[PDB]
Amino acid sequence: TILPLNNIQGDILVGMKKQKERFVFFQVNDATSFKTALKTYVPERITSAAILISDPSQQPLAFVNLGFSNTGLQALGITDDLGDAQFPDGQFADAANLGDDLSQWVAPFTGTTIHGVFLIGSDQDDFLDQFTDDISSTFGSSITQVQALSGSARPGDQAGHEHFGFLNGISQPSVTGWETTVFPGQAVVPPGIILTGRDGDTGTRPSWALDGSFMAFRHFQQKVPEFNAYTLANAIPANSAGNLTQQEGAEFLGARMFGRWKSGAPIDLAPTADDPALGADPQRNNNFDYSDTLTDETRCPFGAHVRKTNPRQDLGGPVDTFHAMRSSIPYGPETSDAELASGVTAQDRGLLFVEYQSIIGNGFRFQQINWANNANFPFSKPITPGIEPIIGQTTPRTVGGLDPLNQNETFTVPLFVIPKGGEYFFLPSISALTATIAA
C-alpha cells in the first residue's frame, strides 16, 4: 500500500511539532453556512502529512487540522456509524470509566456541546493568532467558539520537555505504507492501527472514513511543586551503584516513576544514573524492550509510565494492536522558585494531550484502563506492579518496586495530573472534509 500523504491530516501521522499550538473548540450554529465556508477553507489551510514532511521552505507559517465530535457530525447531517464503541457517547460519558474525578471537569467539556476542534500549530504567537483570526473571519457566525486552549513548548533547554521536567515525544510507532526513518527499538505497525479503513484496522468503517483517525484529547492540569516535593520526601536512599544524596535520590525516584530520566535516557538502558547524551540520541534512546527485566525491578519498575503505556516484551513479543501516535503540548508558565519552595501549585500549567488511533478502545483507552489503572498489569510478575504513578487513576494509588533495592516496598502516590476535560474526535481525510462533510 502507498498512503496518500497529501490526503491525510498531518498531525495524525507526522505531528505538527510546533512550539505553539491552539485548540479551538466550537459548536456549529448553521450547518449550511459552515459547509460553504469549509469548502473554501480546507484547500487553503488544512495541512497534510505531505506538507509536514516537506522542507520548511515549502511550509505555511502555521498548520491547521480539524476534527469533529459525534454531536458535530450529527449537527452536520453526517449520520453513518463510524464503528467506534466510545466515539458516539463522547468522553464525558466515558470519564468515570477512565477513573476521572468528575468534580474536576469543567465547561464546556461537561456534556457534548462541543462539535469539533481546529488545531493550529505554529512556531510563533503572531502566526498562531493570525491563523486563529482567519478561522473566526472565514466561518463567522456559522460557528461559536466555546473554548480555546493554547499551549507552548517550554523555554531554552527545556524545549520538548513537559512541566515535570521530562523530555517527551521520543517513542512513537512507525506505520508501513510510506517512506520513513525507523529508529532502533521503534515499533513498526500496519497503517490501520492509526488510520481508519487501512490494513490493521478491524473496525467497521464507512468508505468515506478512509484515512481518518480518532483523537483522544485530554486537558491535564499538572501539580509540579507537589510532584517535586513528593520525590524529595521519598528520595531513594541508594541504588546498585551506591548511596545517593537526597537530590540524586529524588531525581532517581522521578525517573523510576516515568521509566526515563528527564534527559530522555530510558532507565532500562541507564538504570542507576542519567546518561544525557543517550537521552538526546534517537539512535539509542528507544533501543530497549524490557527483555532484560521481565521478572525483576532493578532495571525498571513494572509500573513505570512508559512501561505501562507501551509494555514491549512484557506482552511476550511485538503486538501491533495497542500502539498510538501522540502530539501533546505543554501549557502554562514555568514553575517559579517560590512555588517549588512552597511545594504548592499557584499557577495553572499542564499538558494538552493528544493521542491518535483507529480504535479508541485499543489505544488511549486500553493504555489507560487495561494497563495504567490495572494494579495487576503487566501480568505474571513476581511483585504486584500497582497503579501507574503519573496517570493511573485507581485509588489507592499504590505502586510497587520504585526502590530497586527494596522492591517489595510500596509507594502511595498523590495524584499530580488532574483531568479537567477532554473529548473524542474524528479527523477525516482531507478529501472527506470537502466531498463528504461539506457536501
Binding-site residues for heme b sit at: 169-171, 260, 305, 310, 312, 326
Alpha helices, H only, 280-419: 305-309, 337-342, 364-365
Q: Which of positions 240-299 make contact with ligand HEM (CB under 6 A)?
A: 258, 260
Can you say whether the dihedral through the CA atoms of 32, 33, 39, 45 is positive or negative? negative
Nearer CB in complex with ligand NAG: 13/244: 244
Instruction: Give the 3-state secondary structure of residue 421.
Output: strand
Specify the DSSP class assigned to residue 153.
Answer: P
Applying CB under 6 A, among 4, 206, 237, 276 the residue interacting with ligand NAG is: 237
144 CB-contact burial (10 Å; exposed 0-12 / middle 13-18 / buried 19+): middle
Can you say whether the dihedral through the CA atoms of 289, 295, 300, 306 is positive or negative? positive
Smallest gap from Cβ 130 to ligand HEM, in A, equals: 29
Stretch that binds ligand HEM, among 39-47, 75-83, 103-111, 214-222 (CB under 6 A): 214-222
Binding partner selected for residue 170 from ligand HEM, ligand NAG, none, CB under the kind-specific 5 to 8 Å limit: ligand HEM
Please state the residue numbers annotated as binding site: 169-171, 260, 305, 310, 312, 326
Binding partner selected for residue 411 from ligand HEM, ligand NAG, none, CB under the kind-specific 5 to 8 Å limit: none
Tell me how crowded residue 280 is: count the other CB atoms within 10 A of its CB. Answer: 14
Applying CB under 6 A, among 88, 108, 160, 169 the residue interacting with ligand HEM is: 169
Planar angle of CA 229, 234, 238, nearest 5 degrees: 130
User: Does an H or E element contain 134, and which?
Assistant: helix 125-139
Q: Give the count of residues interacting with ligand NAG (CB under 6 A).
A: 2
Smallest gap from Cβ 360 to ligand NAG, in A, equals: 47
Nearer CB in complex with ligand NAG: 202/245: 245
> Which three cell numbers, joined as nine digits, stand for 75?
449537527
Binding partner selected for residue 415 from ligand HEM, ligand NAG, none, CB under the kind-specific 5 to 8 Å limit: none
Binding partner selected for residue 305 from ligand NAG, ligand HEM, none, CB under the kind-specific 5 to 8 Å limit: ligand HEM
Binding partner selected for residue 367 from ligand HEM, ligand NAG, none, CB under the kind-specific 5 to 8 Å limit: ligand HEM
Binding partner selected for residue 387 from ligand HEM, ligand NAG, none, CB under the kind-specific 5 to 8 Å limit: none
Tell me how crowded residue 375 is: count the other CB atoms within 10 A of its CB. Answer: 17
Binding partner selected for residue 237 from ligand NAG, ligand HEM, none, CB under the kind-specific 5 to 8 Å limit: ligand NAG
33 CB-contact burial (10 Å; exposed 0-12 / middle 13-18 / buried 19+): middle
| Distance (Å) of CA 216 to CA 247, 364, 426 | 36, 7, 9
Per CB under 6 A, 272 contacts ligand NAG:
no
Applying CB under 6 A, among 367, 373, 374, 393 the residue interacting with ligand HEM is: 367
Binding partner selected for residue 142 from ligand HEM, ligand NAG, none, CB under the kind-specific 5 to 8 Å limit: none
Specify the DSSP class assigned to residue 173.
Answer: -
Of 288, 285, 289, nearest in space to 312 by CA: 289
Beta bridge partners, 26, equal 116, 145
Applying CB under 6 A, among 207, 243, 295, 337 the residue interacting with ligand NAG is: 243
Applying CB under 6 A, among 131, 214, 220, 261 the residue interacting with ligand HEM is: 220
Smallest gap from Cβ 328 to ligand HEM, in A, equals: 7
**Can you list the pairs that 333-338 forms with residues at least 24 positions away whose Cβ atoms lie under 8 Å?**
334/154, 334/155, 335/163, 335/224, 335/225
Stretch that binds ligand HEM, among 249-257, 304-312, 376-384, 396-404 (CB under 6 A): 304-312
Residue that the C-alpha cell 521520543 belongs to:
170
Nearer CB in complex with ligand HEM: 77/333: 333
Nearer CB in complex with ligand HEM: 71/393: 393
Stretch that binds ligand HEM, among 20-28, 60-68, 73-81, 167-175 (CB under 6 A): 167-175
Number of helices followed by number of strands (H, E) in the chain: 13, 15
Q: Which residues bind ligand NAG (CB under 6 A)?
A: 237, 243
